[PDB]
Amino acid sequence: PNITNLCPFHEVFNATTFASVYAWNRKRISNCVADYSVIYNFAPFFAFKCYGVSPTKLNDLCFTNVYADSFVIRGNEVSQIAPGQTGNIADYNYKLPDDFTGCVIAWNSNKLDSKPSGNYNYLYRLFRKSKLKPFERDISTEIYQAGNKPCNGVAGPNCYSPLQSYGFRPTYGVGHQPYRVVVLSFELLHAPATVCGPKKS
Amino acid sequence: LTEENAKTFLNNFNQEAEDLSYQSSLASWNYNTNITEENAQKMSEAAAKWSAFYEEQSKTAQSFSLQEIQTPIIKRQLQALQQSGSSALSADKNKQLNTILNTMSTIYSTGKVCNPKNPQECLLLEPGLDEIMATSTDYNSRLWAWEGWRAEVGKQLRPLYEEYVVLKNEMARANNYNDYGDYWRGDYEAEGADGYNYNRNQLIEDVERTFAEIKPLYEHLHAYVRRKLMDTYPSYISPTGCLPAHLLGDMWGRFWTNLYPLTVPFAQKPNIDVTDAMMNQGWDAERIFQEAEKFFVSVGLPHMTQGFWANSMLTEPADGRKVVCHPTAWDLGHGDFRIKMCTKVTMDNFLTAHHEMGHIQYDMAYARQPFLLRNGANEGFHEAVGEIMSLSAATPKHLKSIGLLPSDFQEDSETEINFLLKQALTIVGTLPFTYMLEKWRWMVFRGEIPKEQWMKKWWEMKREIVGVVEPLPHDETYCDPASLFHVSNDYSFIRYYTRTIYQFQFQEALCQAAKYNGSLHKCDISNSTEAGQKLLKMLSLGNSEPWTKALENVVGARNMDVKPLLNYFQPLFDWLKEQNRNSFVGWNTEWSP
Ligand SMILES: *[C@@H]1O[C@H](CO)[C@@H](O[C@@H]2O[C@H](CO)[C@@H](O[C@@H]3O[C@H](CO)[C@@H](O)[C@H](O)[C@@H]3O)[C@H](O)[C@H]2NC(C)=O)[C@H](O)[C@H]1NC(C)=O
Ligand SMILES: *[C@@H]1O[C@H](CO)[C@@H](O[C@@H]2O[C@H](CO)[C@@H](O)[C@H](O)[C@H]2NC(C)=O)[C@H](O)[C@H]1NC(C)=O
Ligand SMILES: *[C@@H]1O[C@H](CO)[C@@H](O)[C@H](O)[C@H]1NC(C)=O
């Protein structure tokens, strides 16, 4: 049958504004045809690591739901978006489970997310009481109480605001430049799988 | 617990620090490479914000007590952060000390000595008097320039130094130091595991021990220089006496490198200058830095970043903006590594490019360390790791490998002898001067030298250690050390001595690593990945570990050793012994003409 109702991948890998890694954006993708070839030809990618499926077979596989998680991190932290990893991003911002089936895609975004005065609109969580569970988000801005005395809401001695700023600048080194990351998580349930690829004749 | 609070404090600190330090370094770069008033005021506010933030964090960091911190990396970071420095005094004393420092800086930079009977020929030190010290052969003109700058600087800087010593002593005793000399010797203090412990009081005796065996080589070099200068100056230099202070090629006698035309061993043999070969093959600054990068990747160290090539200035811009001519390696932060060098296509700038890229490689290697540990192991390590690259780059093997020197080049012993003598005049001749100056400053700050017997002590030690006599008697109204740039502007001077020792220690360690079987001065470390890894183990550390551990990581020793330095200058030492048989090696303390 005719190929129509393609999945909106052109709205995930090409948004005018991405999200901070602490409040990472999640888009559910269902009831459409998955043309991953647009993903392939969308930029040169610093990493297209796929955990649990092979990069080619994707189009011929049919999954029930596809989650596209989009955020901006610094280049040095791209290695942390993988199962079994530790760091500030993996423990307090974005965690992938150890049985993660999907792909992580990252590319450099100096031309879009770097400013010379400093881009202070990308934030990350540096301090959290406990590590994050997989696919969890914390948007709380509660003052991190690192000592014994109560903070009382006001920032002060041994009381640090948990969200720090990624002060991106165009002259930074390759490991510190902003990188846009889209994580595709494929899940199968008992429900009929409604996200499959294109067919030809 | 205090240690967990310190860990979270340092985590909170590094993110804000890195950003403000990058803003300060970027503003300093934008001023240094586009000198104007607006870039100066932008640099001023950036440094003001960074300094205010650093003092604000240092006051909170001093609340932590180090007796209950066990992990040595956190303890070293908190040690680095808790150094208040000059902020420990009150506002009045700090303002008075800053006033004294500023007036010393602006009276040294505007120093003026003028020709007697010729009042229009008034000379500054930086453009014209250094030319007289470097090139002129006339005894009376050098006596004039030396005595005149001594008078019109020492007479004006003696009381300034008198209260400068007292204010620096107050600042040091406010920072739990015995004197200002111990405050400077605290840069070599290493607190760590057993056997790697270094103390401030140990440094003096280590310097004296390493000067106990450089003294024969220096004595033979001094005798040879004295005989050649006696050939130059017929009756004004004595065979058994010390050298006059104004005949040493510099204003203060710091470097003897300007005595090479007068003291050349073999005048008929030319030098190993390859400037004309660079001119003939159409080399430019880009090719100079690319050859330096090729050297650093052949030895195993990483390539230069794309931001290094994009952001650095390697040429005079010539588009209307003023720049500083001095080559400087900049670690701006966040993976930004730049070099500011107005590179002309010469051999000296080629070696300088190797030196500054050695600085950048050292900076790049410890970027994985925390923010407060992104420094050198001590003040001597950073310049030694560039001087070793300058040493290996200048060898005839390296020059024949890269096409600068012809393939059929013959290395006779005479060019090795005169090259080693030029290296000795630059390197060996600065060591008694450096040791004597730092010993004088240490004993002045300690109070071992009485206040009214300053000058009489200094000219004794220059007769004893350096073997250099005063040309005219000086009383205590002079301040003869203060004519030097490093002492009138509050700079430590022992870093050059430690740099000189560490340089040859590193070179012998890397040449043993590279399995070189010849004389040490001919050694090249090109194409020796294992030597690069041996080096990079120390380079990756920064000041995270004690400097004795980093020194053991390279050379296998935990202290300064001058056996590599004497092994480097061994052919020259044998040659100088062979041509000092008839003459008298050594000097007599009493003033001999
Ligand atoms: C470090 O390693 C490099 C690479 O192994 C060495 O460069 C090589 O140097 C030799 C001799 O200079 C070159 O051989 C000759 O090259 C010319 C020009 O192409 C050619 O006409 C000759 O017939 C002969 O092949 C060789 O090409 C060159 N290789 C490269 C990749 O540059 C370098 O000399 C080594 N340095 C040291 C100090 O050992
Ligand atoms: C050198 O510095 C001057 C000012 O310090 C720069 O001139 C500024 O350029 C920007 C961008 O074009 C303008 O917005 C400013 O108004 C200019 N200021 C002045 C006073 O002219 C100049 O561009 C710098 N040159 C380089 C090569 O960076
Ligand atoms: C992708 O981004 C570029 C950059 O502005 C834009 O020109 C292009 O139209 C975008 N394409 C889609 C399909 O969104």
Numbering used by the authors:
A (entry chain A): 330 to 530
B (entry chain D): 20 to 612
Task: Provide the publication's sentences verbatim.
The XBB.1.5 variant of SARS-CoV-2 has rapidly achieved global dominance and exhibits a high growth advantage over previous variants. Preliminary reports suggest that the success of XBB.1.5 stems from mutations within its spike glycoprotein, causing immune evasion and enhanced receptor binding. We find that while the XBB.1.5 maintains a high binding affinity for human ACE2 as similar to previous variants, it has a diminished affinity for mouse ACE2, representing a departure from earlier SARS-CoV-2 variants.
Focused-refinement of the XBB.1.5 RBD bound to mACE2 was possible, allowing for detailed analysis of interactions at this binding interface. Figure 3D shows that the positioning of mACE2, relative to the RBD, is preserved between BA.2 and XBB.1.5 RBDs, suggesting that large structural changes do not rationalize the binding affinity differences, rather a dissection of interactions at the binding interface may provide mechanistic insights. Indeed, differential side-chain interactions are observed at amino acid position 493 between the BA.2 and XBB.1.5 RBDs. While Q493 may have been expected to gain an interaction with mACE2 residue Q34, this residue is found in a rotamer facing away from Q493 and therefore beyond typical interaction distance (>4 Å). mACE2–RBD interactions at the N501Y and Y505H mutated sites are near identical between BA.2 and XBB.1.5, suggesting preserved affinity at this site. In sum, our functional and structural data suggest that the loss of interactions caused by the R493Q revertant mutation lessens XBB.1.5 spike–mACE2 binding affinity, yet the binding affinity is not abolished due to preserved favourable contributions from the conserved N501Y and Y505H mutations. While the XBB.1.5 variant contains the N501Y and Y505H mutations, it does not harbour the Q493R mutation, and as such, we hypothesized that the absence of this mutation may impact its ability to engage mACE2 and could represent a departure from the omicron lineages with regards to mACE2 binding. As expected, this assay recapitulated the previously reported enhanced mACE2 binding by BA.2 spike as compared to WT, while demonstrating substantially decreased - though not abolished - mACE2 binding by the XBB.1.5 spike.
